[PDB]
Design a protein around this ligand. Structure first.
Ligand SMILES: *[B]([O])([O])[C]([C][C]([C])[C])[N]C(=O)[C]([C]C1=[C][C]=[C][C]=[C]1)[N]C(=O)C1=[C]N=[C][C]=N1
Ligand SMILES: [Mg+2]
Lengths: 212, 231, 222, 244, 240, 233, 195, 235, 204
């Protein structure tokens, strides 16, 4: 799995891969590793399949109940802490989660929280999570700036997942892009790695090691 | 008088007034009729509305594919008791792969209602029920009273003005019992029976409620234009 | 020490068409190197035009199907005989599975039917409740033998158009019910040859707007 | 069933009063008078034992004045048995606080805790309230010397000088007349005894009918000493102040 | 456990235990709340039947629930401590889970919910307490003032009073408080609050307590001399 | 979690044209010790069902008591207890199957493998299996333990599929069962010569045969077998 | 987490705590503040198992803040430290213990003295002039033993702290991405933004 | 005294019948259902002019497709609303769909009779629950403390209910527009209210399939009041 | 891993003519790391002295617990608890945690205020009372202390002589234990005066 999210001038970019594996067997190449918690909040999926699905859908129910009760959008801080407090209750029982809770509010601005099944809850600008996280970090750290255009920021996220998809055996399939603004997230398509690799190689002049 | 404050108190003549007051709630309820042949069993119920803007309160509840009832009195108490029947019918199917006998379903309702008449704090159920069903011994019709008394019958009626429909069925006993393999004629007899309890008002398309269960017929409820055929 | 889990073998396959869906599964039941039954139905009609199969440990498989069938019954009671849609059934099954997250139903569940637009639908579950809508899914023992064949012959993966040499992909034309059944039969015939736990018989349930139909075919009994 | 016999101890009257609390206060008004007076250099606790006998063993007797810890003491007015239930709870609370924070419990925190227990018996549980009123005399390093009172309602208030039990109306008037802010312990001792001597229902005030206690910084250097007076010591202070 | 239904309906559709709890509030000392343009003031009556009191240590009538919200009350004193404690706990629990202090409306809604729960729970009587809750939401400069009562209903008020002779001071406020132009300064708001209490109090000595709450956790209680200056100025203008 | 102590070996069964046959030997083993020689492991329920049990005997006796109690309970307030509302094989099985799966789910199983043989109200043959894991399956022939490995192959030569059932008479079926019991005695080290057999027919009802013995055994060829290879004497 | 240090000088307490957070193979963050303000004149730093650390710290923070509001009074550092110890001593015999070590630096306004308390996850409390948790003490205590004198100024304390951090950066295998330093004195708590 | 779950000689529960009297003392709430939407309207009834009327919340959202209005002891409604919101959201979690309006109403009514010697007394508040679903379209229900609920084409509850219901009897037909229903609620509220109706002491709301449940602004309602005055003066 | 030797430390007690003595080291460690040289292991409740070795968190917890209990004792009994009675209270309190014990090695020392008789006692971690006439030892260097005490001790020593004996027993035992040392304290106890002496020892 490779999932990333980063803050910038235009809001938040979220990018994930699509692969699911049982040992060396590729179970699925079409997994939705981004969860649409609501029109304004996204959650990424890494680790064990069910846990992140189940509890982040549940998180959406808690957020909906909050804004029904309080007549106001839930903060990213409060939404992330509901999930982290929940998993902390299950600590030891064997949950397996690594996720980024991403949102954009008036009081906070674009915010990302890394939430973890050991109970960890970290605010930050850039996060990469999964078996291919190290590969994605390389591309991000060297190319990341605050003053990135929405177009360039989207490409960087797409390119960083591709880097991991190539090298990491347990990452691949396709790339799902999302862009998060204050008025909500915007889906930016499914991109098959099989077609994306040859396209990027040709246009970018990268991957000269690979023959095409 | 001094012995009607709670259900735990007998009167000097050996009466339970709280149970009798619960029985009174049934008499205030709208009329409903039950009757059966050897192949089918039918429930006919007169639904009651609050006013012209309101809907007509539903009277018939399905318990299983082969069993269901009609109510008269406190509707929420019918929901509690019908829910209990649904569970018991279901426990029989899941554990024993066995459809729950109608007679045994009556025994369970009797015992549930009884506990509410002997303990302090609680109250009796305020509803009467007419259970129909088709099991391994053919068609059946039961009458439940919240005193705990359950009775198997060919036909009966409960609610306001139910005596008129009950007399009609007592006359027609020999005729309608013989209506085998003809659902429409058995319903006709039920619609004609409930008509003996009407005053001022008549059976309209959103007033009438009919249910039937039989040999090769799952428990199905008919409302709206589906009962215009029988008006 | 007592081991509460076992493996009853078997293999299942779900394919979603344009206005139909099929859920197939072999009829062999086993433990270790013995055959328990040559005909033990594994795919079930659960009502509301939904078919289901829970493959793996048969005790957990039967328990789950039983509880879902029960869930359909109570959905009717509680919500005025409303038809349980395939997407709603899927979400419900997730909660049944996750309820036993720490003592799981050791099964690979697949359901099939039609969505609310009338198009074919298949959903796939892991033992602990993660699920996803799919066009194509094999589950169980010989899943690793069947899926690659379906990637190639249903989704035309790695296939291109002659003359263009890798430039133009083979277009994803829709498959008829007759065409899908052919691929299902060949998938199981092939799996039977190379997997010892697959054989005896093949039972297919086809779901259309008209209802649920069944088809049975013999498989090799060795 | 059982409802028939329930007194319903925790209900409002039409006027918005708690019946049982009011009746408990009526009980306390017949109990022996207890007085507390706070001075700049200490606190005095004086209390009258109820119609005693010559055959009562006084030197081993305790019905009025009780020690909660080394810094806090209480004077009781009401049912003695009820007071001992609460006193043991208060002693435990003080020790819990000491174990937790490694510091002696502040006087108010102890008072609030006991008063909250009394309150609970007036709002829930269906039990009768405690027929007890306390005078708390205590010291801590935040507020220094403090006097409080609590009653069966669970309401508590702070005081410079206060009385509970019998003849509080007459006693409070006499205290209000002669009390001054710059007063000292030795003067407060005299005021407390003089007040009891005038309000007492007995013919004369003697050593065998009194319990007496002082909380003084009259302990060698910056620390506080509790002194529960012995029968002979009460006899001496009665002669010194010129009452006998 | 004791399960007896103490709060129940009567033939005329009244719950007498809730209504008798309001009578306990009527008996309690007067409390008043007035919100200005950039502040809220809480005034409270101290009955002078009790002298020889130690005012340093005696429980004050206004209580801080958090650094930005305060609560005053009329009715049973012992009952009020239970509501204040629960409110203080909930305020810290909110900060812990939501990572943001409570809004004044939320805290009010919680306290009101507790009061309501005690009107249909077995074995308990209602709280003989009505509260005035005032303060400022986090990062907000709009003043807030809410009222609760034993039944559990709550609502927002431009100005409000509760307790004994509250009918009189509400009469005063209804003619003296203008919505189109509320007390623009702290001085004007305190003056109007002291004026309203002077309709009922008796002597303007140690019988009036005043607490001023401003935005951004700025809460202060006025002393005797500071209040006495307001008392002096009000009557000197009145002699005309 | 436990271990089985006193155990019973194979239970074997099959369907035929008008009903079902079931059989099991009368031994209660204590490890390798053939401790108890008079143990009945077929337990009839009414006149339409026979429950055959293998595995732990203490757990078998518990199940025996549950079934005895089931009959008592069914009779309560049931005028048709001996007629339309009598216990069916399918009812008895489903009850046991429920208990077996519940017990394995509490990690405290009834250490058994069970075969419920019987005939339904409409004359249909009933034959289904359940074990300590709650696993269930049906087949024209069913067998537990060693029977699964040795009896089924022989019984499947008579009834190989569903269409072979009407073609199989009661004489042919019983013959096959009795032969299988002999084979098991040759080859199962925890079996005995004495066994019980039960037939449930839709016409002739329940026939319960006790104190049967394995007969017509071939042993004479043993006299010619000498040494393990090279030895001649 | 990794390195947490504490030193008590003449008129203040100084706490230094690493910025790195590592999840196995990668360093997810390099600006993490491993501390919570319990009261205006009391600061607690912490290090231990993931999740448990923050959960425990915030739980303590909430409890002390609750006490402050109820009594309108700040607890002494000694009182706060005893409360924290008891919570950990309770925790160690629980179903799942808090795996958290803490340093509590506070300025007692009554005695006008700075105070440093070291408490481990077992509930082992000691008052010290300087302290540390984990492997931090193994490198730093020899320097502190030589240089600490109890009348140092705050500026002298920071210099001695720099010498400790330099030794850690030389001899520790792990890159802890520097430290966030905070000072606790009579005026309250402040952060040294350049270190 | 006597049991809380006691039956009267007429076969009615004393406490339920007494709670119905408390509802008659409550402020008026009206609901009208049409094929274009359902309208909900309430009388605020502030006890004093110093009370900020916009804090009076007698119309409440349960979900996007279900709204609710209340009358009687409104404090009792808070736990009912909380349960309704939880039931709606929980069903969406379990079934990935909107919950039927009837099913939501049934869930609320199940709380009603859970009282004895559970809560100590019945609820002293009636609810008008309005919503839309795909199966049965636009619906309006009346939920009582007896546990009974009726569906209505139009319904009024509170102190001016029988007068308002008689007016709704004459005015309602199956072809009403949403705009016509809005004015009709305003008209009848104005008829039964003590004080003169304006945008500050009365509140409107609606539920449509497209936009869901919406509480009306005071500016929006003010215009509809002005439109009402003119059309009544038109004849 | 072994709870009783994570922190380290020792306590020793002795009887003399009309007097008792109790002594302890001052070390607290985390295995090999020395953490504190001011961790005193001897506490007193009135005139009754209690030394405690073992796991330090439990040492602290038990001190707080016995302070708690002896304070309630005094309020109710209206007198200070005696050594014989306190010994029974320690035993009771330890045994109530039979299957989840405090990992400690307590030592009681004191003079009965009424009889004037010198008293010492030791316990295992779960309550068993060792009431010796001569001496009691506890901690990570208990073997060493047994050897020192068994040779150095003689009955009826005068207070100032007893000081020398117990001091030399502790010091030389501690110097043969890696987890003990870093300072030492000795309490000399007579019927109505108690002297406390800190000893100069090697700091490694
Ligand atoms: B990803 O690789 O972490 C991915 C994310 C998941 C939400 C789809 N996880 C998996 O595919 C895991 C394997 C795994 C690989 C690498 C790191 C961690 C986990 N798959 C499973 O856990 C699994 C379990 N049962 C069936 C199929 N897959
Ligand atoms: Mg094969």
């Amino acid at each position: 799995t490779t999932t990333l999210a980063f803050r910038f001038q235009g809001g938040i970019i979220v990018a994930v891969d699509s692969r699911a594996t049982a040992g060396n067997w590729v179970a699925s190449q079409t997994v939705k590793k981004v969860i649409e918690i609501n029109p304004f909040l996204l959650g990424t999926m890494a680790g064990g399949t069910v846990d992140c699905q189940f509890w982040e859908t549940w998180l959406g129910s808690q957020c909906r109940l909050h804004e029904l009760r309080e007549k106001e959008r839930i903060s990213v801080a409060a939404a992330s802490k509901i999930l982290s407090n929940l998993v902390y209750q299950y600590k030891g029982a064997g949950l397996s989660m690594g996720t980024m809770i991403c949102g954009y509010t008036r009081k906070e601005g674009p915010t990302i929280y890394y939430v973890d099944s050991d109970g960890t809850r970290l605010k930050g600008d850039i996060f990469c999570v999964g078996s291919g996280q190290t590969f994605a970090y390389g591309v991000l750290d060297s190319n990341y700036k605050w003053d990135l255009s929405v177009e360039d920021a989207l490409y960087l996220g797409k390119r960083s997942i591709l880097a991991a998809a190539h090298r990491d055996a347990y990452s691949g399939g396709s790339v799902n892009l999302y862009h998060v603004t204050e008025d909500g997230w915007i889906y930016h398509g499914n991109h098959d790695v099989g077609e994306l690799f040859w396209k990027v190689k040709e246009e970018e002049g990268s991957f000269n090691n690979v023959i095409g | 008088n001094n012995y009607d404050g709670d259900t735990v108190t007998f009167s000097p003549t050996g009466r339970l007034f709280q149970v009798e007051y619960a029985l009174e709630a049934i008499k205030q309820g709208s009329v409903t009729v039950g009757l059966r042949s050897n192949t089918h069993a039918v429930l006919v119920a007169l639904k009651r509305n609050a006013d012209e803007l309101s809907s007509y309160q539903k009277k018939i509840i399905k318990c299983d594919e082969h069993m269901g009832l009609s109510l008269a009195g406190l509707a929420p108490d019918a929901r509690v008791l019908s829910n209990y029947l649904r569970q018991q019918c279901n426990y029989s199917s899941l554990v024993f792969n066995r459809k729950l006998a109608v007679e045994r379903a009556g025994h369970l309702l009797c015992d549930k209602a009884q506990k509410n008449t002997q303990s302090y704090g609680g109250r009796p159920y305020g509803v009467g029920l007419l259970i129909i069903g088709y099991d391994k011994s053919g068609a059946h019709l039961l009458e439940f009273q919240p005193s705990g008394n359950v009775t198997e019958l060919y036909g009966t009626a409960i609610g306001a003005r139910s005596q008129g429909a009950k007399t009609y069925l007592e006359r027609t006993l020999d005729t309608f019992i013989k209506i085998d393999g003809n659902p429409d004629e058995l319903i006709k007899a039920g619609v004609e029976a409930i008509s003996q309890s009407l005053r001022d008002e008549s059976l309209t398309v959103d007033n009438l409620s009919i249910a039937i269960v039989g040999k090769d017929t799952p428990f199905t409820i008919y409302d709206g234009e589906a009962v215009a055929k029988y008006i | 020490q007592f081991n509460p889990y076992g493996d009853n073998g078997g293999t299942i396959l779900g394919i979603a068409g344009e206005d139909f869906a099929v859920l197939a599964g072999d009829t062999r039941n086993i433990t270790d190197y013995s055959i328990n039954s040559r005909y033990e139905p594994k795919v079930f009609d659960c009502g509301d035009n939904i078919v289901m199969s829970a493959n793996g440990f048969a005790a957990d498989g039967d328990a789950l199907v039983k509880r879902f069938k029960n869930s359909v019954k109570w959905y009717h009671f509680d919500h005025n005989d409303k038809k349980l849609s395939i997407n709603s059934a899927a979400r419900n099954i997730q909660h049944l599975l996750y309820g036993k997250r720490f003592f799981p139903y050791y099964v690979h569940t697949i359901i099939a039917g039609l969505d609310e637009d009338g198009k074919g639908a298949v959903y796939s579950f892991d033992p602990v409740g993660s699920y996803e809508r799919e066009q194509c899914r094999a589950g169980g023992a010989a899943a690793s033998l069947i899926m690659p064949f379906l990637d190639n012959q249903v989704n035309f993966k790695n296939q291109y158009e002659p003359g263009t040499n890798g430039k133009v992909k083979k277009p994803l034309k829709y498959l008829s019910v007759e065409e899908v059944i052919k691929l299902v039969r060949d998938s199981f015939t092939s799996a039977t040859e190379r997997h010892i736990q697959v054989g005896d018989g093949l039972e297919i349930l086809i779901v259309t707007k008209d209802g649920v139909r069944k088809e049975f075919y013999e498989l090799k009994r060795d | 069933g059982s409802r028939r016999y329930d007194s319903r101890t925790t209900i409002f009257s039409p006027e918005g009063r708690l019946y049982q609390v009011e009746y408990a206060l009526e009980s306390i008004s017949h109990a022996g008078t207890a007085i507390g007076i706070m001075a700049s250099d200490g606190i005095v606790l004086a209390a009258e034992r109820k119609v005693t006998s010559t055959l009562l063993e006084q030197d081993t007797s305790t019905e009025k004045l009780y020690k909660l810890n080394d810094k806090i003491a209480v004077a009781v007015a009401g049912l003695t048995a009820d007071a001992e239930i609460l006193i043991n709870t208060a002693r435990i609370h003080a020790q819990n606080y000491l174990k937790t924070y490694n510091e002696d419990i502040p006087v108010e925190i102890l008072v609030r805790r006991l008063s909250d227990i009394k309150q609970g018996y007036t709002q829930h549980g269906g039990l009768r309230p405690f027929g007890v009123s306390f005078i708390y005399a205590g010291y801590d390093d935040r507020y220094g010397y403090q006097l409080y009172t609590s009653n069966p309602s669970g309401n508590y208030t702070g005081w410079k000088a206060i009385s509970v039990g019998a003849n509080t109306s007459a006693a409070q008037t006499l205290l209000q007349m002669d009390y001054k802010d710059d007063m000292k312990v030795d003067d407060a001792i005299e005021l407390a005894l003089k007040t009891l001597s005038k309000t007492t229902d007995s013919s004369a005030l003697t050593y065998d009918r009194l319990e007496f206690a002082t909380i003084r910084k009259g302990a060698n250097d910056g620390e506080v000493y509790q002194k529960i007076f012995k029968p002979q010591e009460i006899k001496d202070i009665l002669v010194k102040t010129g009452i006998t | 456990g004791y399960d007896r239904a103490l709060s129940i309906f009567s033939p005329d559709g009244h719950i007498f235990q809730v209504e008798y709890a309001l009578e306990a509030v009527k008996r309690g000392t007067c409390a008043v709340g007035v919100k200005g343009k950039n502040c809220v003031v809480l005034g409270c009556e101290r009955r002078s039947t009790l002298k020889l009191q130690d005012t340093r240590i005696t429980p004050s009538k206004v209580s801080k629930i958090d650094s930005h919200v305060v609560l005053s009350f009329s009715g049973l004193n012992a009952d009020s401590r239970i509501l204040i404690e629960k409110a203080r706990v909930e305020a810290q629990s909110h900060r812990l889970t939501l990572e943001d202090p409570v809004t004044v409306e939320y805290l009010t809604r919680y306290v009101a919910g507790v009061q309501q729960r005690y009107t249909q729970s077995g074995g308990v009587r209602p709280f003989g307490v009505s509260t005035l809750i005032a303060g400022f939401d986090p990062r907000d400069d709009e003043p807030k003032l809410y009222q609760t009562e034993p039944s559990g209903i709550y609502s927002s008020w431009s100005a409000q009073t509760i307790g004994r002779n509250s009918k009189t001071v509400r009469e005063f406020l209804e003619k003296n408080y203008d919505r189109k132009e509320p007390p623009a300064t702290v001085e004007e708001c305190v003056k109007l609050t002291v004026r309203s209490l002077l309709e009922v109090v008796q002597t303007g000595a140690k019988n009036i307590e005043i607490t001023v709450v401003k935005p951004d956790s700025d809460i202060v209680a006025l002393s005797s001399e500071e209040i006495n200056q307001y008392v002096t100025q009000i009557e000197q203008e009145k002699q005309e | 979690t436990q271990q089985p102590i006193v155990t019973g070996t194979s239970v074997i069964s099959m369907k035929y044209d008008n009903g079902v046959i079931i059989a099991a030997d009368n031994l209660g083993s204590y490890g390798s010790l053939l401790r108890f020689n008079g143990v009945e492991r077929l337990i009839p329920v009414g006149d339409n069902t026979v429950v055959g049990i293998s595995g732990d005997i203490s757990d078998m006796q518990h199940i025996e008591r549950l079934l005895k109690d089931l009959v008592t309970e069914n009779a309560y307030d049931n005028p048709l207890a001996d007629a339309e509302e009598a216990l069916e094989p399918s009812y008895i099985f489903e009850y046991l199957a429920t208990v077996m799966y519940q017990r394995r789910s509490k990690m405290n199983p009834l250490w058994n493998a069970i075969i419920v043989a019987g005939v339904q109200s409409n004359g249909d043959q009933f034959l289904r299996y359940v074990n300590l894991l709650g696993v269930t399956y049906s087949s024209p022939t069913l067998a537990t333990g060693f029977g699964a490995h040795m009896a089924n192959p022989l019984l499947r030569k008579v009834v190989d599929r569903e269409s072979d059932i009407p073609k199989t008479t009661v004489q042919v079926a019983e013959e096959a069962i009795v032969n299988a019991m002999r084979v098991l005695y040759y080859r199962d080290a925890r079996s005995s010569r004495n066994f019980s057999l039960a037939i449930i027919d839709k016409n002739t009802g329940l026939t319960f045969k006790k104190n049967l013995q394995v007969e017509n055994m071939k042993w004479d060829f043993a006299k010619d077998i000498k040494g393990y290879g090279t030895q001649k004497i | 987490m990794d390195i947490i240090l504490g030193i008590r000088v003449q008129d203040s307490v100084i706490l230094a705590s690493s910025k790195a957070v590592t999840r196995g193979i990668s360093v997810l963050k390099d600006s993490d503040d491993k501390t919570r303000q319990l009261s205006p004149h009391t600061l607690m730093s912490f290090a231990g198992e993931a999740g448990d650390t923050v959960q425990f710290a915030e739980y303590i923070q909430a409890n002390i803040q609750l006490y402050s509001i109820r009594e309108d009074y700040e607890l002494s550092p000694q009182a706060v430290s005893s409360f924290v110890r008891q919570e950990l001593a309770k925790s160690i015999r629980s179903r799942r213990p808090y795996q958290v070590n803490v340093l509590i630096g506070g300025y007692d306004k009554k005695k006008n003295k700075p105070e440093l308390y070291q408490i481990d996850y077992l509930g082992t409390k000691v008052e010290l002039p300087y302290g540390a948790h984990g492997y931090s003490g193994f490198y730093t205590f020899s320097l502190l033993d030589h240089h600490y004198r109890p009348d140092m100024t705050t500026e002298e304390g920071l210099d001695l702290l720099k010498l400790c951090v330099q030794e850690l950066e030389k001899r520790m295998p792990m890159d802890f991405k520097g430290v966030i330093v905070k000072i606790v004195d009579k005026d309250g708590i402040r952060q040294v933004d350049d270190f | 005294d006597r049991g809380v779950s006691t039956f009267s000689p007429e076969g009615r529960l004393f406490q339920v019948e007494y709670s119905l009297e408390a509802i008659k003392l409550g402020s008026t709430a009206i609901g009208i259902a049409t094929k274009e939407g359902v309208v909900l309207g309430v009388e605020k009834r502030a006890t004093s002019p110093l009370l900020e009327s916009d804090s009076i919340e007698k119309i409440v959202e349960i979900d996007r497709h279900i709204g609710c209005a209340m009358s009687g002891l409104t404090a009792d409604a808070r736990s009912m609303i909380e349960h309704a919101r939880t039931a709606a959201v929980t069903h969406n979690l379990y079934y990935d769909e909107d919950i039927n309006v009837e099913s939501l109403t049934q869930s609320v009514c199940d709380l009603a009779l859970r009282f004895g010697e559970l809560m100590s007394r019945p609820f002293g508040v009636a609810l008008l629950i309005a919503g839309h679903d795909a199966d049965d379209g636009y619906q309006l229900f009346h939920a009582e403390p007896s546990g009974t609920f009726y569906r209505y084409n139009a319904k009024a509850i509170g102190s001016g209910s029988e007068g308002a219901q008689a007016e709704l009897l004459n005015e309602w037909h199956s072809s009403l527009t949403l705009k016509e229903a809005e004015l009709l609620v305003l008209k009848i509220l104005k008829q039964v209210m003590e004080e003169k109706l304006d945008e500050n002491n009365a509140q409107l709301s609606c539920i449509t399939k497209q936009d869901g449940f919406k509480i009306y602004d005071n500016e929006k309602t003010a215009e509809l009041i002005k439109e009402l005055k003119e059309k009544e003066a038109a004849e | 891993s072994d709870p009783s030797s994570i922190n380290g430390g020792i306590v020793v007690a002795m009887t003399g003519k009309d007097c008792v003595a109790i002594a302890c080291d001052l070390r607290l460690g985390s295995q090999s790391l020395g953490v504190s040289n001011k961790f005193e292991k001897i506490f007193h409740y009135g005139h009754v002295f209690l030394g405690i070795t073992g796991l330090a968190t439990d040492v602290t917890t038990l001190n707080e617990m016995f302070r708690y209990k002896t304070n309630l004792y005094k309020l109710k009994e209206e007198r200070a608890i005696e050594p014989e009675t306190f010994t029974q209270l320690v035993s009771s309190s330890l045994y109530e945690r039979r299957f989840g014990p405090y990992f400690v090695g307590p030592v009681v020392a004191g003079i009965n205020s009424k009889s004037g008789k010198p008293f010492i006692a030791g316990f295992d971690l779960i309550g068993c009372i060792d009431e010796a006439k001569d001496f009691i030892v506890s901690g990570t260097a208990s073997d060493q202390l047994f050897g020192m005490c068994e040779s150095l001790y003689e009955p009826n020593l005068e207070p100032e002589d007893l000081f020398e004996t117990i001091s030399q027993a502790l010091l030389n035992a501690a110097d043969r234990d890696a987890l003990s040392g870093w300072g030492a304290v000795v309490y000399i106890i007579k019927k109505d005066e108690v002297v406390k002496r800190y000893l100069k020892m090697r700091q490694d």
